[model samples]
Target: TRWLTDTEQCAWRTHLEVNRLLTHQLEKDLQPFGLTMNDYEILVNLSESEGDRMRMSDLATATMQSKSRLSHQITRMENANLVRRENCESDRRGLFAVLTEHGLETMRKVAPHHVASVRRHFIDLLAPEDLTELDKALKPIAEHLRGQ
Candidate 1:
């Protein structure tokens, strides 16, 4: 599905491998505390939202994960009592994921450790200028490639 000059192909793969491995390391850090990266993201999205509630579909799109994956994540969070799914008001067949008090408490506890882990593996390795350049280089590609 991709074409790269023979010489550049390895360079591209190295970049992607580092990207994958970096997140994998961070996700590993979160495991002892019992949240997957997906769970952490869902928690953050819910916590930052108004009244700790947002549309389930909106959350999925914002999280940029596949449809069924996000749905099951929501369901699992519900089973854990971290979030509750509510019927959306403006339309039928829509739902909202509400962060419970328990979930908020969990976020309060987990965020600091996650932030530190990120600094250790990714952000702190890059100079401030490099981080800026990284964002500049990736943002358009991210937006362009999102739906593919």
Candidate 2:
């Protein structure tokens, strides 16, 4: 395999470090709410979906998690009364993850803090031109990876 040049290596390593560090920081910020980033992710997805619910399989796919993993996570959320599972009437074998009222309230309370964390750590650090350029640079990479 061809080696990356110093310039390319710097860019690649910086991207990796930034991704890891930022995510960890965001996760830390969510701790005060007794939530992990993954938990918040599920909350957001269910809250925004129609009827505050999505099929278990669909939610797994949407979160890029395995069915077994999502099922375990959902169980934890259910214990917290953040979400509950419901049988899909049209499909006896299917299940839906429905956001609970408590989950919605939690999300509504936490969202502003999450947004502020994002702004403080990432968004506000970039200038307008840099933000535009970053978006331009990442889109092709995102598209190519999604195709894979």
Candidate 3:
């Protein structure tokens, strides 16, 4: 395999470090609400989707989690009254993860705080043009990976 150039190495390492460190900090910020980043992400996806629900497979894909892992997570959330699994009417073998009333309330309360945390840790760290450039550069990578 070809080695990365010094400039490429610096860029890649910085990206890795920033992602790790920022996500760790964000996780800490969510703790006061009794949530993790993954939990928050799941809620956000469900809340943003129609009827505050998504199928298990689609949710797993959306969250970049394995189906088994998402199952465990759904159980935990269900215990917290945040989400529940419903057997799909048309497909007996399929299930939908539906957000509970508590979950929607939790999202309403937590989203602003999460946005602030993201701004403090990541968004505000970049200049206007830099943020724009970052989005422009990252969108295709995200789409291609999603397609895979």
Backbone clash count, each prediction separately: 0, 0, 0
- Candidates 2 and 3 compared: the better one by TM-score is 3
Cα-based lDDT for every prediction: 0.89, 0.94, 0.92
Candidate 3 deviant stretches above 4 angstroms: 88-93
Angstrom error of the Cα, residue 8, model 2: value is 0.8
Error of 1 at 132 (Å): 0.6
Ranking 1 against 2 by lDDT, winner: 2
* Best candidate according to TM-score: 3
- The lDDT of model 3 is 0.92
Model 3 scores a TM of 0.91
Give lDDT for model 1.
Answer: 0.89
Name the top lDDT candidate.
2
RMSD after Cα superposition, model 2: 1.8
Can you give the TM-score per candidate against the true fold? 0.88, 0.90, 0.91
What TM-score would candidate 1 get against the native? 0.88
Superior by TM-score: candidate 1 or candidate 2:
2
